[PDB]
Amino acid sequence: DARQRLKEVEVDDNGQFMTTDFGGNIEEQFSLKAGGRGSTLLEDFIFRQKLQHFDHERIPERVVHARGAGAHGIFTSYGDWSNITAASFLGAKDKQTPVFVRFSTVAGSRGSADTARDVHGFATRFYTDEGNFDIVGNNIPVFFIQDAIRFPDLIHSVKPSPDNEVPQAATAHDSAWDFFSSQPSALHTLFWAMSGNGIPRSYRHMDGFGIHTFRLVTEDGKSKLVKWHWKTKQGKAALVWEEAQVLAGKNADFHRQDLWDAIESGNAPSWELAVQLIDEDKAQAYGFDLLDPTKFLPEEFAPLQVLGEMTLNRNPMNYFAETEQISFQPGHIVRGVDFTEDPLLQGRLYSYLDTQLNRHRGPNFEQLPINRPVSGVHNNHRDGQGQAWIHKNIHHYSPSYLNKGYPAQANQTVGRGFFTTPGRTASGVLNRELSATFDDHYTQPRLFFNSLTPVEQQFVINAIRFEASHVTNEQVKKNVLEQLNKISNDVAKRVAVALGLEAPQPDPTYYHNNVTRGVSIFNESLPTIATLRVGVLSTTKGGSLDKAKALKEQLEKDGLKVTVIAEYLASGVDQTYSAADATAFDAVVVAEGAERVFSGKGAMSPLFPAGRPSQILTDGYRWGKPVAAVGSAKKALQSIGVEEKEAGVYAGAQDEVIKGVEEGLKVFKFLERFAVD
Amino acid sequence: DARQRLKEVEVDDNGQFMTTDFGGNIEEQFSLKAGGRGSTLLEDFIFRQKLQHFDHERIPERVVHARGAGAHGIFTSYGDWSNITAASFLGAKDKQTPVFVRFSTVAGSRGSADTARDVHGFATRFYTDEGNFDIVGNNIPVFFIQDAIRFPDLIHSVKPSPDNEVPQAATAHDSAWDFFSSQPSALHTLFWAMSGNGIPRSYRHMDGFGIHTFRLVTEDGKSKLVKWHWKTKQGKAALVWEEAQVLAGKNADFHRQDLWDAIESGNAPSWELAVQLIDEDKAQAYGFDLLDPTKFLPEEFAPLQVLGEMTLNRNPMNYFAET
Amino acid sequence: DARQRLKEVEVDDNGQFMTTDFGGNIEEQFSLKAGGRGSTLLEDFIFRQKLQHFDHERIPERVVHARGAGAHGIFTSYGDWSNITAASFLGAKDKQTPVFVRFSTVAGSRGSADTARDVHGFATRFYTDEGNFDIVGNNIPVFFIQDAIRFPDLIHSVKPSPDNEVPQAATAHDSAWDFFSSQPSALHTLFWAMSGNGIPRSYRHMDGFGIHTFRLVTEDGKSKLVKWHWKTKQGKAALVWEEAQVLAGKNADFHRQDLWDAIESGNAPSWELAVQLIDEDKAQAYGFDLLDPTKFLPEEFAPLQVLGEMTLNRNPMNYFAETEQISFQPGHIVRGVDFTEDPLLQGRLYSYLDTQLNRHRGPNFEQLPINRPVSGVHNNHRDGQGQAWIHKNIHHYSPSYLNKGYPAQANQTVGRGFFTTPGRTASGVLNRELSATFDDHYTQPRLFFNSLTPVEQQFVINAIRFEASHVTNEQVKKNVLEQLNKISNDVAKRVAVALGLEAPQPDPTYYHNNVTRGVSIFNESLPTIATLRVGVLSTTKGGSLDKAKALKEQLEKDGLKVTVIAEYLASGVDQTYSAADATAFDAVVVAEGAERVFSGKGAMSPLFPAGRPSQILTDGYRWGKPVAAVGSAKKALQSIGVEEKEAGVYAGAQDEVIKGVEEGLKVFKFLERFAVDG
Ligand code: HEM
Ligand code: HEM
Ligand code: HEM
């Protein structure tokens, strides 16, 4: 159990009498009053201690990535990697290390929807036997800006307008696209966020990236430049925007529910930890500067090397104590890893330590159960708010005769101490500048766009079309068109159509036709359909329910999660039509006999909104899902003008429908259903 | 201008050079580095003062009613009500008092949707010449529970399940209806929340209520029991649930945007302040106890007497500092 | 070991390599720099995690009683007291409960002197098996004010002037005596603070008082009114003001070091817990209202009944984590005890809970090791800053079908719950008033003053003379005299002399000659001299040192702490004359031979300030200590004008001096040496 160290702080209230927070059994369902209909007494200590704790429950949300969810797991190393890193957690084959991972959006506040379009966080803590090591990454390999001092500018522009705090969890407003076009480094991450990466199907269907180049360091000090990669074993999958919008309202918790359900059902998600390793003398040899976080390294130049595997298999017991309180830091580094001069990374190190003082209102946040390491803490730190330990060493300073030299110093040769990469030098003048090697903001956005399928490209175009059409200021829209045109004239032209503007003339300076593998989502089918969801549209009249039950049993043998839907909660029915929506499902199937609720009064019961079954089938079809109908339920497909010989549409006998649905779920999205310019 | 008194704390940055928070002009678009492709220096006081303020921007959300929005306005008294209260802001015909009103839901956190089904807050501050007077009310005249010591139980049961923090801004889950059925006092407010009051068209189309019976006291100390009421001059209007669900995704800001646009276009919304006035010896006359916040007083027994009108006609300038 | 439960949060760093707070071995004696003489890098994560923790070490001091110290110990019940209370820590003979006690002054901030003149705090936590029970008491049985809403007024007036923050830890300034005379209820505690209770010899030599009337309640709801008393087994003892003033500078830590030394040396101090018990119908029976905390109940009307004894035998390991962080509350009440309508106690219940929010900046301060109960916490409280537990019950509300009714309600009949005294009632109008039964502010100050010895009375007079003479405003000094005159025309007259004013004519409304027992300090010799300190003035030249060593050996046989003083740290010398002062000792003894440093060449060494040996002996004599000289050292006594026949002065052979000093230490202070008016 990855949560094993946390059991000593678990509190079981089963079978017990209510108490105060300082002990003593109580009743706390009535205030103490002076007389039968009298005023409440200030001497009611029970009331005030109970209400004080309630009054003080909230702590500040994270300044970014406030909306997210997490889980525990285990990381297993595939080998003894000591030839590239002294990192203990990578030091032996089959070596296991506990982890906790939090996934998140970026812009929205604590209660914003999971399926907003956004960059997504992917933060991993390794509780190594040599200290906590955090990889604080995103589901996108590049970031918007090249210097950490610009982060408040980026975040202010994306977050809601400060006059009215509109809009929530959205880049589709004037200030974001003003910044995107005034700071053209942003264009690469922008294109990624406008692709499927901005609207993933679930946390389990995302890749992860450290973005920055780091260093792996061996015991003698030999270093390699490294990029961290998480490769989902579930396959990458994304929604379509019109679907994600409705899902934002029908289930704001879609992604955290998905992760919770997969772990609880015994379908733990996994990721492989992989690296690109680069010689120090090739930092600038691949057409860009590896210190520049707006660029990724094409895998053709450096293929991935697989270090091990992470599997998340334990949900938290208390969300707040665990998920909400955990404090990630890119400064959480261990021996065998070092930083680089990435000016974005450089400033993060300050900012994540400092922000914990705001969120936790004290300096002892590392003493919280979720933040504690497993490898033991020995230093001369004392006091501060909420100090939870009692230190024995009376001589809390160094150097010292009285403490016999303990706690002792550790370095590269003694005590397995951290050490900075020995060959690292500084040269030149102190400067408030960025290297001229950072200057190309358009080539890799073009490279990224080139590497998507044609409909995938149309999705990016249509995201930019939807977003920029919310920009009220006309000159900002023209500013956006001018920047997009530097990436591709065709992109600028197709976006310009939607804005009623004229696209500029071609500016070929950064145009090119190069492509790179691995950045697409829709060009690859899924490696497994386990945990994917099927909505079975049935009805309580006739034999439809009996057939739906049998249909559900066969589908479940493939590991599918099946919801039988009917007008009310009869036996065998998992969900009502009133509560049902196509956004919850990966496939939609009409059980035989249920065609009766797609027309007439059968479609107008007081038990659900008019047209609800037809809307579920229409939504599922238009959003590209596998849709099907058993036997006589083909009438439901006909009722919405859908024909069986279309891709992703299945009809016939129950055996055929099951095989087709299970096959179509591998394709996941049927892109034949989306027009291209 | 209702915001007049706030002019003295407003900060204009037009045409200005950038500074630190202790003065002195700066640039803050590049970190100071030790060489051309070098590391950032600790002695970059500009970076750290800028990022420290960013790192510490957030404060805890309200424990309840975290999602909401507000506006400034003016309350005007229709008469000299000294015969029923010594309250200065009600003491003369046409006397004007600045107000600020914040509307809200209850259960959802800061970024949850406006069109979630919920009780709605309707909280008014009168900046009177004898102190701030707050009517902290809802759009429903009755509350779930009868004793304040039970508020953490109600809220915990309605807010997300504490293992997975699901579901956001919704009573449609096990713990909420476990509480509603275990604490039957809650059934009255539940029915109101299940009605159109739970999914109103806009803040401007809500009535407001103080819920509790208070007292109005004259100079000589004679008292009347009183219920506060806000009657919308816009009329009450509600969505249908299947529409509110989609709208929650298509525009989570529907209500705060609606209030903002109405003020910005010059269509300031208005509410009449009204009271029900009850003699002390009638506290238990109408089939219930007027100390019981799970009951409202039927207007057949005590009509609404209009005292004045409130108009909200100025949006905030900075949402965080004000709202 | 009373600290046994705390052992699981103790951290041992011996034998270990240095780490960060998130693990990983490090070195932290050099900042990471860009080149040989280069600037420090922001990526030095080691530097910042270490300095951030240092930068945030301090928490707000207590708004009052900021200066203090404490210890762990054990309370032992002497009986099964179920006949008077349901409280479980008093429910069986020989039942043991861990305790932690903090002693304190009131006005001074954290670094102020122990021996400032002040009311003193005496706060005890019983970690009972039915929750933490706190008796938050003082070393004086009455308080300044009758309603808690006036506490910010009282404290603001006593604490430093808000323009310059002068004076530290002192009531000797205009605002305090303006308040004392404008708010005459304050006069009773004022008189106690002007007596020996204001300048005690140590924490171990104080009695303690809960002050308020509380209620004890049996299982069936029967209640008795109660006053809590702590009776020191070490005996009460006080300094003199002119000595406490020098002691404030020579050793600001006098009291906290005294308590620490006594415990580490195996001389654990003890107090008996005793109560006064009176029926409900006595609340207004004794010429005052028992809801009034400016009055005490004379023992002649209700005697002390001892319930048990507390012994403090374990020092803290980390002062900050244990002593600084502990959070007392009079609202920390258990089944078997209830409050009364004391308007001062009523407001305290709110104040102590709320103030923890400022000190600990979070709602979860009860989870701190020193604050945790031993009996178990089970409720539906969740989250909060710094939440240290992981709750398993996901149905965190009541009532509920899904949690099967757990945690379950407890009351008088089920689950040994707390219950308010069943018979308490309210009657009358809501009011912002005090009962007219609170109106007498002068009878009990007079009773207190009448009950002191004559020299003990001079000490009260001379403390008021000292303090009132710092008041610059003439009308305030007059206001003080008119208020003093209502207590005693003689007190007012003798105080008026020092102020150069005319005391008012007699105002006999409240005058009386009644006396009461138990309030004096100097009318009783000490019951033990264990831990008391003897300074032995010697010299490195001659054979004085060898005799002083033999003198030290015999005195330590009687349990005394002996310090041999000489010019330098020779073999057998505990302290140099440069470092020595009379305030540190309860008795001063010149060893034979040491007369050479009281005159001539021996008195003018560069190793100590001029006249230092003579000043130590002079101070000890005039501050009333037993002083002595062995053999030829009687020259030192003659060199300061002191003669053999005086009380508390001893000379002769070593055996004679040792016997005389040890019996004089029980007298403790020789009041023959202080002039009385007249
Ligand atoms: C490669 C660039 C970046 C990545 C991959 C990234 C990723 C993340 C992630 C995943 C989180 C949430 C961790 C969690 O789940 O609790 C987070 C939070 C945060 N980030 Fe970043 N971020 C980047 C850039 C920056 C920069 C440049 C700054 C400021 C200099 C910054 C400041 C913060 C802060 C203050 C938090 C709040 C963390 C907390 O409150 O615990 N980030 N970031
Ligand atoms: C008639 C019953 C109630 C009504 C009408 C009501 C209404 C409101 C409203 C409108 C707000 C939001 C104020 C704003 O917009 O800033 C609020 C917040 C709040 N309420 Fe209530 N509420 C009621 C019951 C209670 C009870 C019983 C408690 C606890 C004893 C409580 C505790 C709170 C707290 C702690 C806040 C947060 C205020 C802040 O952080 O500024 N409420 N309530
Ligand atoms: C009979 C009257 C009183 C007695 C015997 C008394 C005693 C004490 C003692 C011994 C302490 C120090 C506790 C410790 O060692 O940490 C203390 C602190 C304190 N007292 Fe009182 N006091 C009295 C009156 C009051 C009143 C009337 C108030 C306010 C209404 C008050 C508010 C406080 C506060 C806020 C603290 C700080 C507690 C903390 O920060 O933990 N006291 N008092």
Side-chain angles (χ1 to χ4, degrees), chain A residues 19-64:
Chain A
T19 79
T20 81
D21 280 337
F22 56 94
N25 297 352
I26 60 175
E27 58 165 322
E28 37 77 274
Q29 288 300 303
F30 302 84
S31 300
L32 182 64
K33 313 172 182 66
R37 292 162 80 250
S39 293
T40 297
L41 293 190
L42 176 72
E43 78 172 70
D44 188 351
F45 71 100
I46 293 164
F47 170 82
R48 274 185 294 99
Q49 58 90 48
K50 162 160 180 201
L51 259 294
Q52 177 179 281
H53 204 284
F54 172 80
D55 294 343
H56 293 259
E57 276 178 19
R58 306 295 173 256
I59 72 177
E61 76 185 18
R62 302 156 165 73
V63 68
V64 286

Side-chain angles (χ1 to χ4, degrees), chain C residues 593-672:
Chain C
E595 64 268 22
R596 60 169 305 261
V597 304
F598 286 80
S599 79
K601 173 281 295 146
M604 310 213 98
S605 165
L607 289 167
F608 53 78
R612 172 55 60 76
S614 303
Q615 190 72 53
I616 293 171
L617 188 69
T618 299
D619 290 332
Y621 173 81
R622 283 163 163 176
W623 298 339
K625 301 171 187 297
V627 292
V630 181
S632 64
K634 80 174 196 297
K635 265 183 48 55
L637 289 175
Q638 299 169 344
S639 75
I640 68 163
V642 176
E643 213 274 349
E644 291 47 69
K645 73 195 172 302
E646 301 188 37
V649 180
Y650 314 100
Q654 165 181 296
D655 69 280
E656 198 188 318
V657 166
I658 281 189
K659 166 180 60 138
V661 165
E662 288 174 346
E663 57 195 26
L665 274 170
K666 307 195 201 99
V667 174
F668 192 65
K669 291 294 193 183
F670 282 87
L671 293 200
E672 291 91 352

Side-chain angles (χ1 to χ4, degrees), chain C residues 490-507:
Chain C
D490 189 55
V491 167
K493 269 163 40 176
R494 293 154 75 181
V495 165
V497 172
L499 312 185
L501 292 162
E502 189 194 345
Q505 286 304 289
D507 190 343

